[PDB]
Design a protein around this ligand. Structure first.
Ligand code: U5P
Ligand code: U5P
Lengths: 237, 234
């Protein structure tokens, strides 16, 4: 199970900035991502605005709280009409299950429940930071595999991980399990706070289901040329 | 903090306002979580602040450093009193959150206090070992995450009542311990594991208590809050 459209991370301070950026893409089919920055400024109105513009939407809020709060918060998000939403696998199985139940109960009859994925280890987290600061003694790749397996056992559709863990995840989980991979940059682009990086080309090779691309498109001199170059490499030209 | 933080775990602004109505003009420390905020957005924070409520925005930011920094700048325009991140995000991330918070806060306005979630009050040691893969004890992990938060410049942590004494042995006395997992004597524990009463929270050195269902699911919420308040003060 793979997604053809690169998920564009709309990391802007306002709806206005977002809509200005999206202006040259008016006739293009889009898969966009609304994160904490844009959502905490505008609220549910921005999700509604982008849905009216027929964009496929990933609401990347990474819910990490107690089982009942995540369950109740997912009921609110399922009422919004998003296509993909997420939680942290570091919240445990009971929490990931409650999240799934929340999405199921909050989704009206006639429409499909939003796809739910779990964040394993953030693409900005190195093995050294994971061992010393988080106190996880296992290797990063093993922790990601374990977290992905916990997500599947909980009834989830997939995970957020880096491209370099995708092959190992598929040795433990089902082939239809989603691997949504951020930490994507072009060859001549800066890594920023990302530590486990890959090009759209390397992402296709290692078997990523979907790629989340932000700054490589948004902070480029020509975002239109950048999105075209990202998609060509992702499709195989 | 003399005022127990009420967890406004409601599905809309109207259900929150209707809960808050019998309290009238009494000073309240309230908490807006994921449920209320993801439904109403920034508007609910702006509404509660006009009724002179002390506010805790419990969104528990857990993302990459730059996203948390940028997101904290947006939350700092809302004028809240307390906000949080997950310590499981690392030091670089907690530092970025502090920077975003101090940068986004308008001049003349007080910078919102930033606290870090250690291990959720609903997480047990078995779940922390088998599922999260942390081989160290829950208590030692909470103390380590508290130290990471302090070295990052944060004001405190969210932990359970049972870790407070252990945290204070490693951190500064001015460091905050905001403690949820609060239930009265006969109240059902629900999904909470490391439970305590408002009285035991006072005895173990908690800075503030977050109370939800013991108040919100009671027959008379105002009477329930008073019982929780008097047990917390003395
Ligand atoms: O493990 C993860 C999960 C999510 N994101 C998100 O994906 C986007 C990647 O941004 P950029 O590094 O491509 O510009 C951001 O909105 C960020 O919050 C990551 O970077 N890593
Ligand atoms: O470790 C933590 C951190 C935060 N909360 C929050 O505090 C409130 C406590 O709910 P209740 O168990 O008192 O009803 C909830 O909104 C929840 O999200 C916890 O319960 N545990």
């Amino acid at each position: 199970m793979k997604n053809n459209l690169p998920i564009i991370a709309l990391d802007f301070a306002s709806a206005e900035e977002t809509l200005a950026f999206l202006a040259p893409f008016q006739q293009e089919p889009l898969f966009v991502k609304v994160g904490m920055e844009l959502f905490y400024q505008e609220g549910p109105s921005i999700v509604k605005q982008l849905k009216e513009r027929n964009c496929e939407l990933f609401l990347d809020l990474k819910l990490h709280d107690i089982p009942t709060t995540v369950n109740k918060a997912m009921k609110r998000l399922a009422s919004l009409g998003v296509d993909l939403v997420n939680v942290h696998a570091a919240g445990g199985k009971k929490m990931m299950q409650a999240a799934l139940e929340g999405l199921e109960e909050g989704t009206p009859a006639g429409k499909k429940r939003p796809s739910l994925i779990a964040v394993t280890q953030l693409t900005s987290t190195s093995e050294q930071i994971m061992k010393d600061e988080l106190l996880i003694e296992k290797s990063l790749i093993d922790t990601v595999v374990h977290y992905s397996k916990q997500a599947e056992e909980s009834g989830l559709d997939g995970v957020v991980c880096s491209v370099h863990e995708a092959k190992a995840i598929y040795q433990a989980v089902s082939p239809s399990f989603l691997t949504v991979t951020p930490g994507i940059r072009m060859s001549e682009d800066a890594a920023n706070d990302q530590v486990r990086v890959a090009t759209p080309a390397i992402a296709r090779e290692k078997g990523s289901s979907a790629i989340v691309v932000g700054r490589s498109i948004t902070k480029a001199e020509d975002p239109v040329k950048a999105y075209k170059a990202v998609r060509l490499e992702w499709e195989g030209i």
